[PDB]
Design a protein around this nucleic acid. Sequence first.
RNA 1: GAACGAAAGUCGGAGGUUCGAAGACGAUCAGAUACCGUCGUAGUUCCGACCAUAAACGAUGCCGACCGGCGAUGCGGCGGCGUUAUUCCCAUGACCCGCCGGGCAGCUUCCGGGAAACCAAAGUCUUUGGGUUCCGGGGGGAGUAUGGUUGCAAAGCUGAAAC
RNA 2: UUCGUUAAAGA
Lengths: 125, 215, 81, 222, 55, 97, 129
Amino acid sequence: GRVRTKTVKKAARVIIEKYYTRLGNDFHTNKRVCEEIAIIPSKKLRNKIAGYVTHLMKRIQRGPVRGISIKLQEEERERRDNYVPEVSALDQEIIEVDPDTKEMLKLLDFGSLSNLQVTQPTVGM
Amino acid sequence: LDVLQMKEEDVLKFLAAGTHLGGTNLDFQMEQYIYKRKSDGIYIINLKRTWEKLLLAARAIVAIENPADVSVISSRNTGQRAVLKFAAATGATPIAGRFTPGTFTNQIQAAFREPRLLVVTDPRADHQPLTEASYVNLPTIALCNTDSPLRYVDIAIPCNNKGAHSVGLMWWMLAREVLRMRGTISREHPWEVMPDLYFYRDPEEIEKEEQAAAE
Amino acid sequence: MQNDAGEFVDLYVPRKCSASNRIIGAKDHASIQMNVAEVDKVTGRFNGQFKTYAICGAIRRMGESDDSILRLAKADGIVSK
Amino acid sequence: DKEWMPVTKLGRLVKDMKIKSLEEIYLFSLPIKESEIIDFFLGASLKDEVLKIMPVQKQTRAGQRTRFKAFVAIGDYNGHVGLGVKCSKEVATAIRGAIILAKLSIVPVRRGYWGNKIGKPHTVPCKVTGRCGSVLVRLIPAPRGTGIVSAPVPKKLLMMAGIDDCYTSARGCTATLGNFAKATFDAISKTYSYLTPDLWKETVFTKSPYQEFTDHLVKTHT
Amino acid sequence: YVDTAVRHVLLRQGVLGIKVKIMLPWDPTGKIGPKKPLPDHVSIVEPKDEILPTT
Amino acid sequence: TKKRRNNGRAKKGRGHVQPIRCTNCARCVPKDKAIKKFVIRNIVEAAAVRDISEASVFDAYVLPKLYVKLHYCVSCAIHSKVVRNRSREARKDRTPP
Amino acid sequence: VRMNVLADALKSINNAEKRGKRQVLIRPCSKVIVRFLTVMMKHGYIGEFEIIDDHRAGKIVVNLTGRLNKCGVISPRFDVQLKDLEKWQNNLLPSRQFGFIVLTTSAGIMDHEEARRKHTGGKILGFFF
RNA sequence: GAACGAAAGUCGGAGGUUCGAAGACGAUCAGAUACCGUCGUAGUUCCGACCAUAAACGAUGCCGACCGGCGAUGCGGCGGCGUUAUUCCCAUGACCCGCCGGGCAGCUUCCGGGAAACCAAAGUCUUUGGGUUCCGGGGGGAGUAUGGUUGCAAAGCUGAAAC
RNA sequence: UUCGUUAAAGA
Ligand SMILES: [Mg+2]
Ligand SMILES: [Mg+2]
Ligand SMILES: [Mg+2]
Ligand SMILES: [Mg+2]
Ligand SMILES: [Mg+2]
Ligand SMILES: [Mg+2]
Ligand SMILES: [Mg+2]
Ligand SMILES: [Mg+2]
Ligand SMILES: [Mg+2]
Ligand SMILES: [Mg+2]
Ligand SMILES: [Mg+2]
Ligand SMILES: [Mg+2]
Ligand SMILES: [Mg+2]
Ligand SMILES: [Zn+2]
């Protein structure tokens, strides 16, 4: 029943792209805001556009949306990331992986601190 | 040279991220980048020529005075996180994920750009910028694996672009060398934060679980 | 191209490729003029001086450019030992 | 009489008046996108001729759905010609589209000598060839004042190219202009692509115009 | 929106039907076209907001 | 024109393949060309396996399988719905799951 | 089976020029082939070349340039008199100014320009431009 | 010029299961003399002879070289404190990894070709020449007539003109 | 399970 037209979704995306701070979660306010900022002749089209605008607001305010992205949402995407945990960035200096990369560290001159010794059969694939 | 040589912190971060191990299939232009094959299918990439191709990629990026002419694109989710913060780091253009083919060809699309250089993550996942390079005359720097084709690629950095920690380590070290060539960060100055922004974040299940365990 | 008078008669001198020494065409859109800058001493300072490597269309399509840039800059002395 | 509204950064270089000649664009083989760039450069390259207005038919449920296909060859007589092909439902629309695509697909023509080096070149530099479809068209150098001996369509194309003297040899269905004119266009396009023994030395490697006038492009974009 | 006319032409082969339909342009002020806008067309205003935040 | 690179069958080294009879129309077709499948049916339909197991002597110790080398030709197999048509880029595929 | 080893050499040279490689391997060795590549060296279309002197028959490796458009062998080695070279001039060379034709004169393997100065003429190995 | 040459066909000798040209019926249709069913002759089988034809196909002559990659397969050869079998070194057996030679093949590719389908050959071709053999010149008439020749015959090979 | 024919032209 809500499989609304591409022109309805396109008008709602133009509204949410141009004017984002004018909109909220209340349908009865967002409809009057959309009628102040746009010209729609049909009242059913008014209600449908404003309802999908409220659905886009509930989607954007909850989670990130690729389908529209203003500069304020870009700064929010920048803000949501900087809390960086320090748990597993670099491990302790005990790594055992390969005798082949042990031979690599023997050829190309480095310290080769940790042990590097595994034995594997030829049961690959 | 003499300061562009690899150090113990660099090789420790390489062995911690695990980029010395690659794919199981060879390519005929990756023989100069592999050194010694290993049992159980996995192959071993050398580190010196990886560092040297990263050095030349940094030289090619710093070689333009305008940093906005360098486009950085990744489609897969292991690189989508690193591309955005790499573009926010120094000067690059943030565009990742769905490429919208026709990005560089037609002009009725508002997402049309005129870059001078392109750096991509995976050639098999970014075959379409490799196709559209041939109409704009721009080079390509690609974080290539041992089983990746090399059509329309000028600088190939041999690595494991499947591991998210490897991809994040490479974008961090590339931005590190680019900023050290630009002069923002000196040589005897480590980076201010551990490279995890460039790595990855797991969404809200075990993220909030570890948060509630760390409260 | 010169005449008996020694004039420069040709309209433009096209770019000879730095990989296969082949003339890059005027409509060969699969070509590239790569740019790599020079590096200073222990300080690691950027220089305005840069060298240009022309790579042509068939080399870029076959994938010879990845081997070709390193085998071209190895004689330059900027990529490796 | 309208504002040109520059795009694609090459037109912004042209309206910043930094690329002094179209030879500087063909040194680097940059892609042209809008057609009025070479009209800003060359005002005498408007000499063109429509070669054939032929119809094509598509069989649909209504019946045949016709649309006309226009071939327009433009050219400056100093060695710059273009060939545009465009099909549309209207005659004048197809003609204007073929003119615009010829302005896009203009190429420079290399003019050589028959074997004496007096000056003012009058012929192709060597025996070149061009193939489109099946039509092999071979262009052969000619002595001074010989003329163009060919079919009238590539004779007019070479007369627009400024090749005063040339011999031709065509094999295939020469009757189809949509292959024969494009084969002649490929033959006159390969003239610079031929490796010639007066182009031995390593080139100067001049700087790109983007690198040379980056800052004007930055201050006109931002 | 559409003025439609159906007329006859008497030629030697018989009668022929001609049908001329014209969609009129939108004119909000004037007797040339209709003043009612299209219900499909949703027109938006330009971004009005500008400079000068706090101080 | 060539519709198939393999020309239908798999004869590429040799020059003669033995004609083995079809199942429905009994036409002799060379065995690298005929549709040669292998049906493993249960000897009782599962709608009556439970009835025989409840009305049987042994306590569910025997379950025989009926094996048939089903061998159609490509003239009746299309009518028998096995080897239905595909597209130009779809002829290059392999066995379905 | 094995005949016209100069053609066997120049087809390998031509495929290497069309591919864009650096150096070729040529399994026969003739003094014909050595003098032919010496003429090509003297006119600078190829570079330095090294002949692995095998005990049976050596192997020539030519450091290419990326310069050759076409080099080939005229097959039956026609007997060409003077005042008949102009047919091969208009038939083989792309222009009057370009290219050279290797003749087989009486005083050694020579060139198209050297043959009219020596005033000998003779047989044709091939052509290169 | 010569040796083989599917199936059918011909001449003798032995038999004759099945299928089955012709043939006889039973049916469907306006009409079957056909497609469907029943019976069944020559043949299909073997040993001796002849015929020399096919969509005898890869609708693609043979010899030699060059120009991409990948995963497999068949046959030898080589290397690998790997696994598995005898009773225990000992030799081959089975599996795994990699290379070599030539072989039937496959996937991708702007290496190049071609009208395209498509082709690592159908590429190295107007920038045209490695050697050699046989054949085509609009469609019919016509692989026909008339000659020559082979054959027991059916027919095979060579094979034009008028219009 | 079976179901025959419709010319010359006319875009
Ligand atoms: Mg014709
Ligand atoms: Mg068909
Ligand atoms: Mg057969
Ligand atoms: Mg027989
Ligand atoms: Mg008898
Ligand atoms: Mg008998
Ligand atoms: Mg009958
Ligand atoms: Mg019977
Ligand atoms: Mg025959
Ligand atoms: Mg033969
Ligand atoms: Mg084996
Ligand atoms: Mg044995
Ligand atoms: Mg009819
Ligand atoms: Zn059947």
